[PDB]
Amino acid sequence: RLEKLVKFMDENSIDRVFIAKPVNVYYFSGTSPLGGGYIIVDGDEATLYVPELEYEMAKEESKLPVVKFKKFDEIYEILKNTETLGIEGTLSYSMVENFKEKSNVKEFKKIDDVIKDLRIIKTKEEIEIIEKACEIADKAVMAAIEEITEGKREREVAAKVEYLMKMNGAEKPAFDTIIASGHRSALPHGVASDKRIERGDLVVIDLGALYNHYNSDITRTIVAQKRAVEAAKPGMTAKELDSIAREIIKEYGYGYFIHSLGHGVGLEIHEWPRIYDETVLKEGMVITIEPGIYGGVRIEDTVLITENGAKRLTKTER
Amino acid sequence: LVKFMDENSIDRVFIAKPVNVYYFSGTSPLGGGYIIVDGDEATLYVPELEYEMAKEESKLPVVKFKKFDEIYEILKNTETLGIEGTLSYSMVENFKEKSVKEFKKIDDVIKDLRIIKTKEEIEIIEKACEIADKAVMAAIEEITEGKREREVAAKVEYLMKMNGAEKPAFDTIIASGHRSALPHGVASDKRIERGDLVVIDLGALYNHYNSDITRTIVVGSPNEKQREIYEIVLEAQKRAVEAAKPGMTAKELDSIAREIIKEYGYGDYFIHSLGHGVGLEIHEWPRISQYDETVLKEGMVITIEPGIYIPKLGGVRIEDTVLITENGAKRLTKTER
Ligand SMILES: [Zn+2]
Ligand SMILES: [Zn+2]
Ligand SMILES: [Zn+2]
Ligand SMILES: [Zn+2]
């Protein structure tokens, strides 16, 4: 929503805004050019700037007016003498310095707050896409379980599962597929390796699908989470949600629960909010719920916050 | 880097980009590795649960942290902090508030080091290119009428991983028909039709190093214009590869291919640079373009990839990964053009 961006620009005294992060360029333009895409909001509205190699593709996809540049150096001329330039916190130091030296920009203000507030609430159209990515992720996890046998390498299972996801319409995996067996299960971010699975080992299967620009996330462990999903009644804070699962684990005597309970999922695999965080959970928010004890066990579902509750978008047996 | 720091009055350096962390430490921590150079001594900082693995592999002293916010304390009151140009605005502002009175770029020395590949580096790129070669051959054999572009990409990416690659170097391009007119036409749901030009652009990431190859085919027999454009791109590509040598600038190399395509009347349709550097990243220094004048030197690894793109009709691109040797250039990708 560009209307909310302009409204943010108005009450923070920002003249022009520059957006360069591919995910945010998509969110506001409807297209994401691989070789570079850049939005400038000049007061009232926005336009998409692309290199000539991306012009044709951006033209058929963008809801915004598209103009091509031969040199990136052209953008410094259009933003010349901007008093306050609204930028993403992720914008590189190089680019900031270039705006100061070549465009004579006088001050910079972080536009992160409005992008966070916009992207944190997913529309019905966004939820439909995420549900489809979750369906692909469901199929992939089931395929992984059927493929895990004696002597099989973690990476080989990962490859077949990622092949399955793409054959089912996913652009690519949402992240490096985690398949961790034996002592590797004790590691949370244990990306699949050359190590061979033996009988009696705990195999943590963690994967996601990127489908039509939206992500999914699922973890199953083969050889506490239910209560957290059941408790998420909007109006609740993110910390209070984390408290539920962490309390059960602490009550059993494993309070090993080293990472957070979850994270937001959308155009990126890890986004707002985190489940230290005290954001008020609202309907339309798409989050992850993943408790773990580290031997290693992790159970994770992508969950949608609905009116008076939360529902699982990933549907695989726990 | 230490020499750069002393010359530019840089008290401490902070390196955060994973590829640069790997380049200086010899290890790539799965969570978040960070290098802090204090004068003459470089130290690798890793999350507590990545300490063991980092200690086994790193060529630098390793110190663990529980939280990232500990880094702000270790760079307590450094006047001038040397940073990468890729470092985010948020992080620079964090160093201002939590820790720093001045910031200076260290990009020049990183570029100067990484642009020249060691013999060990070229060996890994060679294997990456062999995998990519096998993938493009598989792609060509896989492409038939009615096949979804994405399905072709799925198969060849699977084959790459089975051949030892960590993952594809970038999102595989299988661009057919009207899609071949788009240089970055990542494989889509589009079904390949008879008479389609099909651009196959892929690469492998193998043991931290990248490869890059493009081949173009026609489904069925090529028509007059398809053959016409193809031969011009082929000529441009061949003549550039033969001309690439030390002493020559990137601009001069780009010009070799650009002048040929312009000669045939397709100058307006060669809508990108001739190529780019390849190493720890798929796109690296130098850029082989009219705007880049870096002198090519021995040990540089670049691509040479001219193209002609006519919208709604299609396009042709042919790309090789090429090493700059003592007296010329050596093709690292070997499949027929
Ligand atoms: Zn996960
Ligand atoms: Zn997750
Ligand atoms: Zn290339
Ligand atoms: Zn390529």
What are the DSSP calls for chain A, one per residue? -HHHHHHHHHHTT-SEEEE--HHHHHHHHS---TT--EEEEETTEEEEEEETTTHHHHHTT-SS-EEEESSGGGHHHHTTT-SEEEE-TTSBHHHHHHHHHHS---EEEE-HHHHHHHHTS--HHHHHHHHHHHHHHHHHHHHHHHH--TT-BHHHHHHHHHHHHHHTT-SEESS--EEE-GGGGG-TT-B--SPBP-TT--EEEEE-EEETTEE--EEEEE--HHHHHHH--BTBBHHHHHHHHHHHHHHHT-----S-S-EE-SSSSSEEEE----PBP-TT-EEEE--EE---EE-BEEEEEETTEEEES-----
Annotated binding-site residues of A read: 206, 217, 263, 290, 300
Distance separating alpha carbons of residues A124 and A139, to the nearest angstrom: 23
Q: Are residues A169 and A100 in the same domain?
A: no
- Tell me, yes or no, whether A297 and A240 share the same domain: yes
By Cβ distance, the residue of B85, B162, B271 closest to A52 is B271
B89·A110 Cβ contact <8 A: yes
Query: Which residue from B minimizes the CA distance to A97?
Result: B85
Asked whether residue A147 falls in the same domain as residue A91, the answer is: no
Query: Chain A contacts of B88, Cβ < 8 Å?
Result: 89-93
Torsion over CA of B283, B289, B295 and B298, rounded to 10 degrees? 50
Cα torsion through A102, A103, A109, A111, rounded to 10: -100
B269-302: buried (b, 16+ CB within 10 Å) or exposed (e) per residue? bbbbbbbbbbbbbbbbbbbbbbebebebeebbbb
User: Which 8-state DSSP code applies to residue B295?
Assistant: B
Residues with Cβ within 8 Å of A237's Cβ and at least 6 positions away in sequence, in order, are A278, A279, A280, A281
CA of A316 to the centre of ligand 1 (A): 14
| Whether B113 contacts chain A with CB within 8 A | no
Q: How many CB pairs under 8 A join A and B?
A: 97
Q: What is the CA radius of gyration of chain B?
A: 22
The CATH number given to whatever domain includes residue A293 is 3.90.230.10
Distance CA A89, CA A110 (A): 6
Spatial CB neighbours of B161, under 8 Å, sequence gap ≥ 6: A155, A158, A159, A162, B167
Selected residues 14-43 of chain B with any CB under 8 Å from a CB in chain A: 30-31
B179 and B257 together in one domain? yes
DSSP output for B101-168: -EEEE-HHHHHHHHTS--HHHHHHHHHHHHHHHHHHHHHHHH--TT-BHHHHHHHHHHHHHHTT-SEE
- Domain of residue B15: give its range: 1-114
Closest chain A residue to B181, measured at CA: A56
Please name the residues in contact with A316: beta carbons below 8 A apart, sequence gap of 6 or more.
Answer: A138, A141, A142, A218, A220
Phi, psi of A259 (to 5 degrees): -90, 175
Inspect the interface and report whether the beta carbons of B189 and A169 lie closer than 8 Å.
Answer: yes
Distance between CA atoms of residues B304 and B240, nearest Å: 7
Residue owning tokens 């410094």: A76
- Residue A154 structure tokens: 């973690």
Cα–Cα distances (Å) from B224 to B20, B123, B216, B227, B229, in that order, read: 48, 41, 16, 5, 9
Same domain, B101 and B197: no
Whole-angstrom distance, CA of residue B163 vs CA of residue B156: 10
The torsion angle over the Cα atoms of residues B326, B329, B334 and B337, rounded to 10 degrees, is -160
Q: Does B68 lie at the interface with A, CB-CB under 8 angstroms? A: no
Q: How many CA atoms lie within 13 A of B10 on its CB side?
A: 23
- Could you give the CA distance from residue A86 to residue A82 in angstroms, rounded to a whole number? 10
Closest to B228 (Cα-Cα) out of B161, B123, B150, B316: B316
Q: How far apart are CA B260 and CA B241, in angstroms?
A: 13
* Count of structural domains within chain A: 2
Helices B89-97 & A93-102, crossing angle to 10 degrees? 90
- How many residues are given for chain A? 318
A90 interfacial to chain B (CB closer than 8 Å): yes
The last residue of one of the domains, among B93, B114, B135, is B114
Residue B213: DSSP 8-state:
E
Q: Are residues A141 and A221 located together in one domain of the fold?
A: yes
Residues A89, B88: C-beta atoms closer than 8 Å: yes
Contact A307, A283 (CB under 8 A): yes
Q: How far is B88 from chain A (nearest CA, A)?
A: 5
- Give the torsion sign (CA, A254, A258, A263, A267): negative
Same domain, A3 and A83: yes
Q: How many residues does chain B have?
A: 337
* Residue labelled with tokens 């001594």: B41
* DSSP calls for B271-288: -S-SEEE-SSSSSEEEEE
- Spatial CA neighbour of B30 closest among B55, B53, B62: B53
State yes or no: B11 annotated in a binding site. Answer: no
Choose one of B94, B114, B134: the last residue of a domain.
B114
Q: Which of B49, B89, B183 sits opposite A87 (nearest CB)?
A: B89
Q: Inform me whether the C-beta atom of residue B61 falls under 8 Å from chain A C-beta atoms.
A: no
Q: Which residues of A touch B103 (CB under 8 A)?
A: 93
B148 and B58 co-located in one domain: no
Q: Is A162 in contact with B162 (Cβ distance < 8 A)?
A: no
- CB-closest option in A93, A155, A166 to B85: A93
Of A34, A87, A92, the CB nearest to B186: A34
**Any A CB within 8 A of B151 CB:** yes
Side-by-side strand order, sheet with B329-331: B284-288, B275-277, B301-304, B320-324, B329-331
Q: Does residue B154 sit at the A interface (CB-CB below 8 Å)?
A: yes
CA angle B95, B61, A175 (to 5 degrees): 65
The bound ligand whose nearest atom lies closest to the alpha carbon of A176 is: 1
Are B138 and B178 in the same domain?
yes
Closest CA to A14 of A46, A43, A35: A43
CA–CA separation, A316 and A144 (whole Å): 12
CA dist list (Å): B294 to B91, B115, B224, B278: 31, 11, 39, 15
Picking from A100, A119, A138, the residue at the C-terminal end of a domain is: A119
* Burial per residue of A192-210, b for 16 or more beta-carbon CB atoms within 10 angstroms, e otherwise: beebebeeebbbbbbbbbb
User: And the tokens for B220?
Assistant: 């069925």
DSSP state of B18: H
Count of CB atoms situated within 10 Å of the CB of B161: 22
What is the rounded distance in angstroms from the CA atom of residue A18 to the CA atom of residue A24?
Answer: 11
Contacts for B34 with CB less than 8 Å, ≥ 6 apart: B14, B15, B16, B21, B44, B45, B71
d(CA A70, CA A74): 8
**CATH code of B70's domain:** 3.40.350.10
Q: What is the DSSP string of B186-201?
A: B--SPBP-TT-EEEEE
A191 to chain B, any CB pair closer than 8 A? The answer is: yes
Task: Indicate if A240 and A270 belong to the same structural domain.
Answer: yes
Distance (Å, whole) CA B72 – CA B103: 15
Residue from A251, A239, A318 nearest A277 by CA: A239
Instruction: Please tell me whether residues A148 and A263 are part of one structural domain.
Output: yes
Q: Are residues A242 and A133 in the same domain?
A: yes
The reply to whether residue B186 touches residue A110, judged by beta carbons under 8 angstroms, is no
Closest-CA distance, B101 to chain A, in angstroms, reads 15
A223 interfaces chain B, CB cutoff of 8 Å: no
